Amino acid sequence: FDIAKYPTLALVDSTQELRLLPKESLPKLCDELRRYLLDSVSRHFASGLGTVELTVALHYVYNTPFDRLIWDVGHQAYPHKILTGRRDKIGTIRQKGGLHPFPWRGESEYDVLSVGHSSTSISAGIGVAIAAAKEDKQRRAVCVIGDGAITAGMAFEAMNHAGDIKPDLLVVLNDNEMSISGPGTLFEELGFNYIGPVDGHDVLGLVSTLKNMRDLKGPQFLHIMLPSYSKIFGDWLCETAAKDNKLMAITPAMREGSGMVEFSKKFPDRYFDVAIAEQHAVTFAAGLAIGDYKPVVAIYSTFLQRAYDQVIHDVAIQKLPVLFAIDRAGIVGADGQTHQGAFDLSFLRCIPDMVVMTPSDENECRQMLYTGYHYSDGPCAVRYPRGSGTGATLEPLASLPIGKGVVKRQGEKIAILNFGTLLPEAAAVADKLNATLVDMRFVKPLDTALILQLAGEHDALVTLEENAIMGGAGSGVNEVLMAHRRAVPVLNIGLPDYFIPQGTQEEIRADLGLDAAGIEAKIRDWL
Amino acid sequence: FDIAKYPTLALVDSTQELRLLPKESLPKLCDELRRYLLDSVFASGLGTVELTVALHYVYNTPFDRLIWDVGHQAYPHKILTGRRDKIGTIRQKGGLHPFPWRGESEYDVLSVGHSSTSISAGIGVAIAAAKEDKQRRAVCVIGDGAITAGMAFEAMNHAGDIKPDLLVVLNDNGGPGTLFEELGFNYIGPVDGHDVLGLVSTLKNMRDLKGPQFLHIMLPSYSKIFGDWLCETAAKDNKLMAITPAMREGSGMVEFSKKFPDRYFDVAIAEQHAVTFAAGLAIGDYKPVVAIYSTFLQRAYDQVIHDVAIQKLPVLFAIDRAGIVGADGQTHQGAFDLSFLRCIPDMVVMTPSDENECRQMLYTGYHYSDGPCAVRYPRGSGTGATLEPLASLPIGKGVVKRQGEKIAILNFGTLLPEAAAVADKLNATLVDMRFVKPLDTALILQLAGEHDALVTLEENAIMGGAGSGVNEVLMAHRRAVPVLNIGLPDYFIPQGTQEEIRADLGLDAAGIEAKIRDWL
Ligand SMILES: Cc1ncc(C[n+]2csc(CCOP(=O)(O)OP(=O)(O)O)c2C)c(N)n1
Ligand SMILES: [Mg+2]
C-alpha cells in the first residue's frame, strides 16, 4: 500500500478510525478510494465506483460492525470491503482462495449477510431490526438495495411486512446498482417514510441525511440517484422464431447471460424480460401456453430455485408444455457458492410429468431444445453449463426418442453412464479402462431397458453428472436397479455434499475430481 | 333439481341461457344461487355470487378467459358452468375438484390451489389473446390475501410495463387505488360487490377498455403438538420466535399467537419473506421457527438454500401437511420435501414417527446451532404415544424396533405402525430411521450385512426421497443388497380421505406386505 499516494485512505484502516476523521476530509477520502479501486481491481465494477460516497457515509455514521449494514447483491459492495480490512486483498476478488465477489459472513464481522442472489437484504434487515429492538441495546440496521433487486417479489413482500409491523430499518435504494450478473409514492404506499431522490455523490450531504434517518423510528426509505451454450441457445431461438409464430421466449432480467441479445432485436415481439422475477417468469409462460403459444423460459439453474413452486404447480400439475432452457448448470466458476447450478437434476426429477434432458455437447443441446419444443404432453427442461462446448457439428434437427440413451463405446466389466457435458472426460476414462460408455441424454424418463442391459453385462456401473450426487441423475439409476431387484453396485460421481467454492470452472472441476484423471482415480479407489 | 326453491337458477344450468336472461332477473338469480350454496355444500363462495353472475353474463365465456385465483370464491362459478348437480361431491374421492381444474371443464382456464397465480397467468393469456387477434378478452379474480404474494406484485409490475388487455378484479373482503395506479393499472373502485346490476354495467365498460384494468370490489393433531411445544418453549426462553405465512390456524398457532403476540409473526401469504425474515432474526441471535406446509415450502426453496443453508443459520422448519393431505388433492400434497431438502448441503431433515418423537425432534432442531433443521409431520392425529421428557436426539441415529431375519424395514416417519404390523407378520427386522439427513450410515451397512433385502418406507416421492438416500449409501459402499423403496408414486396424488388414499397407494399394512411379497 502506497501511503504517499493515498494519504487519507491510509488513515482509515478500520471504520473506528474512519469515524474519527474530520468531516471535511471525507470528499478527499472518497476521491482516494475511487482512485485506489481503479488502480487495484482487475478487469465490470461501475456500481462499485458509483457507491464510494454512500459507503463512506454509511460507515462514518453507523457504528459498524455493531450496527448492521446489509448489502443487497452487486459490486456496490467493493468499497465496503476496502474499508473493512480487505484493502490489500481486493485484487484477489473472484480468484480461487481469494475474496468473495460479494459480502460473505465467514469473511468478515462486517459482512452481515452472504448475498449473490438478489433482493434478500430487506427481508433479512427486517429480521435484524426486530431482533435489535428486542435486544434493547440501541443497535441500528440499514440495508442497501439496487433498483433491479427491488423488482423481485420477495422485496415487495418484505416492504409490505415492514409497513405492517414497522421495524426500525433504513432501506437505501441505490440507483447506481443494477443487481445482476413522483418516485416515492410506491414506497410511501407500502408504509415507508420516503426521502429523496438525493445526490448519491455528495458525501457530506449523505452523512447529514443518514445521521438523521438513523435516529428516526419505523421504516425509513432513502432514495439516492468456440460458441458458448448460451449463444447456441440464442441462435436456436432465432432459427425457430423465423419459421414458427408460436415461439415466445422469457428471461428474468438475464438477457445477455442467457445469450438472447440478438434474439431480442430480431424478434422483439417474441421476447419478454420480466425483470428479476423468476416466479412470474414461469407462470407468465404457463399463461402463454394456455393461450396456445410455445413459451421458452430461459433461466439459470441457481435462479430456477426461486421459481420451483411455479414449475410444480403452474406447469407440471397443469401438464403445460413449457420449455425450460437452464443455463449455468453445474459448476459456474468465479461467482462461487451462491450461484452454482448444483441441484436442478435433483429438484426437477422428483416432480411428476417433468422431462429432464442433459446434453453432452452443443449439437445435443440443439436436438434437445428442438425435442422439448415440439413435445406437447407436458414440460421439458434442457440444462447446460456456462462456457463453450466441444466444437461438435450442428447436425440437422430431429426429435430425439424420449427416454433413450446412446451407446458410445462397448467395453467390458464396467459401464459408465454419463449425464451431460462431462462426456469427453468419461470418454478418455472409458478408453483407458476399456469400459462401456453410454450418453444417457435423459435424466427423466430414464432409459430403464438400457440400464438393465448394462447391469446384466457388467460387474459394476458408474454414473456421472455435474449435479449433486444426493438425489441426482445417478441416484435415479440406483432407484431403477433396486426397483428391479438388481443390486449391481453403482459408483455415483457428481458434486459432493457441500456448497462449491469459487475458481475457474476448469480448476474447480479438477479439484472435485471431475476431470478424466479424477474420474479414473475415483473408480479405482471404489473398486 | 328443486325447481320450486330456485325457479330462475333452474333455467340457467349453462352460461348460454344465463346470457338470455333480461338484466332485471339477475338480482333474483343471485338470491337463489346464494340459497342453493347454503343448502348443498365456504363464506367466500357466498360472497362472490353477484360477481360471478355479472362476469359470466358480461364475458363471452368460455371463449373469453376468466381466471380464478384460489379460494372457495369459485363455488358459484361451477354451479353456473354445468356442474351444479355435482356440487355435493366437492373434495370427495372421485368428486369435483375444490377449485377450478383444467381437465374438469372448458370453463376452468387455470388449475389453482396455491394462491396468487391468477394475474401472472392472466397476463400470458391476455398477451396471447392480442396476438391471436380474434378479440378474445381476459379477466382474473384475486383475493385480498392472495395479492400479498411476491409473485402477484411481480405480475402487476410487468403488467404496468407491457400493458396487456387484462382486467384484474380484486375481491376484497391517499386511498386504496394509489398502489395499483403506481404499478400501472387504471383503477376503479372500491365498488359494491353485491350490486349485480352495478357490476354488469361496470364490467361491460371495463371489458372494452384497453390495457391493464383494475376493479376493486367490496388424540391431538401434530399441529396441536407443535403449537403446544412452541408455548412451552417460549414460556422459558425469550429467544423463541415463530413465523407463519398466513396459516396460523392450520399450523396450530392460535393459542401461541394469543399468549406470545410479541414473538409471533404472520407475514401474510409470503413464504419467501417468511424464510429470509427468519434468517435475519437468527443473525440477530434469536431462534426463529418457520411453520410452513410442505407444499408451500416449495415456494421458499431459494430462501432455504441461499438465505439459510449457505449462511449456516440455525433456523428451525416445522413442516406441517407432510405426505398425503387428503381432501385438498394434487395442488396441496406434501409430496416432495424429503427429496428437495436432502440434496441441499448442511440441512438436517427429521421425520418423527409419533407425537413424542415429534416433540423430541423439535427440541433437537431448536437446540442445534450448526445449521438449519427441518421436522416434517402430516396433517392429522398421532398414535397416543406417551410424551417423554425432552432431550436432544443423537444426530443421524436410528432406533431398532424389532429384530427379525431375512428382511429389514427402514421407516422414515408416521407409517411406522404399518411397518410394525408387517414386520410382525413377516418376522422382519424393523428400524425407525428418524433422520433423512444425515442418515445412520453405520446402521444401514449393518442391516445390509445381516439381511438378504432391505425395504424403505416414507410418505414422500420415491424419486429422490429418503429411501433413495439409503440406496446411495449402499452403492457408495459397493454393497449388493437390493432395496425395495416404498413411497409416493410418480404422479400427483388426487383427493380423498387420507386413510383411503394411503390405502389406494398401498401405504397401509396390507399394501406394504403385498409390495414386499410381489417384489421378492
Ligand atoms: C402460496 C399459498 N400460501 C397459502 C395458501 C393458503 N390460503 C388459501 S386461501 C387464503 C386466503 C385468501 O382467501 P380469502 O382472503 O380468505 O378470501 P377469497 O379470495 O376466497 O375471497 C390462503 C392464505 C395458498 N392457497 N397459497
Ligand atoms: Mg378474499
What's the rounded Cα separation, in Å, for the pair A365 and B126? Answer: 32
Q: Greatest CA separation found in chain A?
A: 80
Q: What is the DSSP string of A17-76?
A: HHTTS-GGGHHHHHHHHHHHHHHHS----HHHHHTHHHHHHHHHHS-TTTSEEEEPSSGG
What's the rounded Cα separation, in Å, for the pair B144 and B315? Answer: 29
Q: Which residues pair with A222 in a beta bridge?
A: A172, A195
Helix (H, G, I), strand (E, B) or coil at B241: strand
Helix (H) or strand (E) holding A272: strand A271-273
How do beta strands A193-198 and B483-488 pair?
unpaired
Ligand 1 mutation pick, B110, B114, B115, max ligand atoms within 8 A of CB: B115
Judge residue B174's burial from the number of C-beta atoms within 10 Å of its C-beta, 0-12 exposed, 13-18 middle, 19 or more buried. exposed
| Declared resolution, Å | 1.8
Chain B residues with CB-CB distance to A486 below 8 A: 482
B144 lines ligand 1 (CB under 6 A): yes
What's the rounded Cα separation, in Å, for the pair A216 and A210? Answer: 10
Residue spans of alpha helices (H) in A111-260? 121-135, 153-165, 185-189, 203-215, 229-243
CA dist list (Å): A218 to A129, A167, B174, B264: 10, 5, 20, 19
Residue B511, all three cell numbers: 399394501
Q: Which residues pair with A414 in a beta bridge?
A: A460
B175, amino acid identity = G
Print the SS3 string covering B393-438: CCCCCCEEEECCCCEEEEEECCCHHHHHHHHHHHCCEEEECCEEEC
Q: What b/e readout covers A236-246, taking b as 16+ CB neighbours within 10 angstroms? A: bbbebbeeeeb
Q: What is the DSSP string of A378-410?
A: S-EEEE--SSB------PPP-PPPTT--EEEE-
User: Does B278 contact chain A (CB < 8 Å)?
Assistant: yes
Nearest residue in B to A184, CA atom:
B182
Ligand 1 mutation pick, B37, B111, B114, B269, max ligand atoms within 8 A of CB: B269
Beta-sheet strand order (sheet of B435-437): B264-266, B240-244, B287-293, B316-320, B373-376, B348-350, B435-437
Residues 432-491 of chain A whose Cβ lies under 8 A from any Cβ of chain B? 460, 468-472, 475-476, 478-479, 482-483, 485-491
Beta-sheet strand order (sheet of A294-300): A271-273, A247-251, A294-300, A323-327, A380-383, A355-357, A442-444
Judge residue A502's burial from the number of C-beta atoms within 10 Å of its C-beta, 0-12 exposed, 13-18 middle, 19 or more buried. buried
Closest atom of ligand 1 to B144 CA is 15
Helix (H, G, I), strand (E, B) or coil at B38: helix
Instruction: Consult the annotation and say whether A125 binds a ligand.
Output: no
Which residues have beta carbons under 5 A from ligand 2 (an ion)?
B 143-144, 173
B44 lines ligand 1 (CB under 6 A): yes
Which residue is listed with cell 438495495?
A145
Residue A458, all three cell numbers: 457388467
Contact A290 B125 (CB under 8 A): yes
Domain of residue A126 covers: 9-225
Question: Measured in angstroms, how far is the CA atom of residue B142 from the centroid of ligand 1?
Answer: 10
Helix (H, G, I), strand (E, B) or coil at A299: strand
Helix (H, G, I), strand (E, B) or coil at A295: strand
What's the rounded Cα separation, in Å, for the pair A302 and A283? Answer: 18
Q: Which residues pair with B170 in a beta bridge?
A: B142, B216
Helix (H, G, I), strand (E, B) or coil at B55: helix
- For the beta carbon of residue B494, count every other beta carbon within 10 angstroms: 13
Contact B284 A128 (CB under 8 A): yes
Query: Which ligand neighbours the alpha carbon of B47 most closely?
Result: 1
Nearest residue in B to A128, CA atom:
B280
Three-point CA angle B280, B283, B289, nearest 5°: 65
Q: Greatest CA separation found in chain B?
A: 80
B76 lines ligand 1 (CB under 6 A): no
Four-CA torsion B479, B481, B485, B490, nearest 10 degrees:
70
Closest atom of ligand 1 to B149 CA is 1
The CATH number of the domain holding residue A82 is 3.40.50.970
User: Does A279 contact chain B (CB < 8 Å)?
Assistant: yes
Question: Measured in angstroms, how far is the CA atom of residue B317 from the centroid of ligand 1?
Answer: 21
Nearest residue in A to B101, CA atom:
A318
Chain B residues with CB-CB distance to A107 below 8 A: none
Tell me, what DSSP letter sits at residue A130?
H
Chain A residues with CB-CB distance to B468 below 8 A: 471, 475, 478-479
Instruction: Consult the annotation and say whether B369 binds a ligand.
Output: no
Residue A205, all three cell numbers: 450531504
Three-point CA angle A326, A328, A329, nearest 5°: 70
Helix (H, G, I), strand (E, B) or coil at A248: strand
Say if CB A351 and CB A324 are below 8 A apart.
Answer: no
Nearest residue in B to A469, CA atom:
B343
Contact A161 B273 (CB under 8 A): yes
Helix (H, G, I), strand (E, B) or coil at B98: coil
Say if CB A512 and CB A495 are below 8 A apart.
Answer: yes
Say if CB B317 and CB B350 are below 8 A apart.
Answer: no
Give the N- to C-terminal CA distance of chain B in Å, as an integer.
54
- Side-chain half-sphere CA neighbours of B273 within 13 A: 28
Helix (H, G, I), strand (E, B) or coil at A198: strand
What's the rounded Cα separation, in Å, for the pair A165 and B302? Answer: 24
Chain A residues with CB-CB distance to B344 below 8 A: 343
Nearby residues of B346 by Cβ (< 8 Å), 6 or more positions away: A498, A499, B309, B312, B370, B371, B372
Q: List residues in chain A that are followed by a break over 2.5 Å (C to N).
A: 43, 181, 225
User: Does A160 contact chain B (CB < 8 Å)?
Assistant: yes
Closest CA to A405 of A447, A374, A437, A443: A447
Four-CA torsion B311, B441, A419, B458, nearest 10 degrees:
-90
Judge residue B258's burial from the number of C-beta atoms within 10 Å of its C-beta, 0-12 exposed, 13-18 middle, 19 or more buried. exposed
Chain A residues with CB-CB distance to B305 below 8 A: 305, 343
- For the beta carbon of residue B427, count every other beta carbon within 10 angstroms: 12
